[PDB]
Design a protein around this ligand. Structure first.
Ligand SMILES: C=NC1=N[C@@H]2[C@@H](O)[C@H](O[C@@H]3O[C@H](CO)[C@@H](O[C@@H]4O[C@H](CO)[C@@H](O)[C@@H](O)[C@H]4NC(C)=O)[C@@H](O)[C@H]3NC(C)=O)[C@@H](CO)[C@@H]2O1
Length: 365
């Protein structure tokens, strides 16, 4: 089974014990490590931090300690946008310029593959035409990757993509059945189902829906996301189930109504280390004494509150539940975002180093 874990090249700027660099990485924790994120300049793959080349080397150098490990470079991301993607896949000359740079870039830095993270083709400013242009991009990469392997005589470069769970987005830009044939594995983003962008508290990653949910609202859970990608044609073994080492917070309109579905006046106080209201690292949810942990029985995930602060998150338990759920589904494995937000150095949760992902590795193996 696969355990695809994401490293992020901006965690390095967090303060104190929250700072994360390749040295905080465990070469054996995951089967595949994906480096987030690499951008694009003139239709080509490029760095995004002043020290990506140094990081790239330490990142991939980890394979000297674990030759079984596979590393990939992720291009895109939420904040990346759609512009540069839509423009790069618009002309053959551009697609080919990108592909050739991807290959040369990945090989130069010792990456084993590329993880496409276009959020998302077919929306957010992306013309519905990009739905089929994406598919072409995938085929182009796959084809070039296959050809190169034979000429260079090296392990063929791997091709993956981070994909949305929403029904609306899959229909809008993904030719599921067709891309699945060319993607070595699909990284399903089964989270962000609920967030502070809503007026009511909801869980970031509920495994199942709540009895009181119907219609489109009943699809906002992992299972729906999974059943969906399978039905549309994804071999269960290529579908990797994503899980978050972060949770989503809300500020309660009143601390008297703390249930899931209660009135939220907006995002929760930013985390002292993550400093991005509405989300929190697992290790930030740990430093909470005097809080109250619940359990959304129907969705098999927890959440905690203290005064006007409510946060739905994942713990060692829900992670075990989820690892167990995917097994039953015959999925290819688990995906986690991000190594970065777990208690990677056992400095806050008192459960050791990488409490959550370690749970994943042990449960999966
Ligand atoms: C598995 N792939 C995958 N891709 C999606 C990610 O985009 C997303 O995580 C979010 O990624 C954006 C960047 O695209 C991050 O933006 C960063 O936010 C911090 C504040 O927290 C800010 O200071 C900047 O460093 C900013 N950097 C950039 C390059 O914009 C975060 O918003 C990040 N969010 C979380 C909760 O990690 C994940 C999860 O939705 C998806 O998974």
């Amino acid at each position: 089974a696969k355990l695809v874990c994401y490293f992020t090249n901006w965690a390095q700027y967090r303060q104190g014990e929250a700072r994360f660099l390749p040295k905080d990485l465990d070469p054996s924790l995951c089967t595949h490590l994906i480096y987030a994120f690499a951008g694009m300049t003139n239709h080509q793959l490029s760095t995004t931090e002043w020290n990506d080349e140094t990081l790239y080397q330490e990142f991939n150098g980890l394979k000297k300690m674990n030759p079984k490990l596979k590393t990939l470079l992720a291009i895109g991301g939420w904040n990346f946008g759609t512009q540069k993607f839509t423009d790069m896949v618009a002309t053959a000359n551009n697609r080919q310029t990108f592909v050739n740079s991807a290959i040369r870039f990945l090989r130069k830095y010792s990456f084993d593959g590329l993880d496409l993270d276009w959020e998302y083709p077919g929306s957010q400013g992306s013309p519905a035409v990009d739905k089929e242009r994406f598919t072409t991009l995938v085929q182009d990469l796959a084809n070039a990757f296959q050809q190169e392997a034979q000429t260079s005589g090296k392990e063929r470069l791997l091709l993956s993509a981070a994909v949305p769970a929403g029904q609306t987005y899959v229909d809008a830009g993904y030719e599921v059945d067709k891309i699945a044939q060319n993607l070595d594995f699909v990284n399903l983003m089964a989270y962000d189902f609920h967030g502070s962008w809503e007026k009511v508290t909801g869980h970031n990653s509920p495994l199942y829906k709540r009895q009181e949910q119907s219609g489109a609202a009943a699809s906002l859970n992992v299972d729906a996301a999974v059943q969906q990608w399978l039905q549309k044609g994804t071999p269960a073994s290529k579908l990797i189930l994503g899980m978050p080492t972060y949770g989503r917070s809300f500020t309660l309109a009143s601390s008297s109504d703390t249930r899931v579905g209660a009135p939220a006046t907006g995002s929760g106080t930013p985390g002292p280390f993550t400093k991005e209201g509405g989300m929190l690292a697992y290790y930030e949810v740990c430093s909470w004494k005097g809080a109250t942990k619940q359990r959304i029985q129907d969705q098999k995930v927890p959440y905690i509150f203290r005064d006007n602060q409510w946060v739905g998150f994942d713990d060692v338990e829900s992670f075990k539940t989820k690892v167990s759920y995917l097994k039953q589904k015959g999925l290819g494995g688990a995906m986690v975002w991000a190594l970065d937000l777990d208690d990677f150095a056992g400095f806050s949760c008192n459960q050791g180093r990488y409490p959550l992902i370690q749970t994943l590795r042990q449960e999966l193996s």
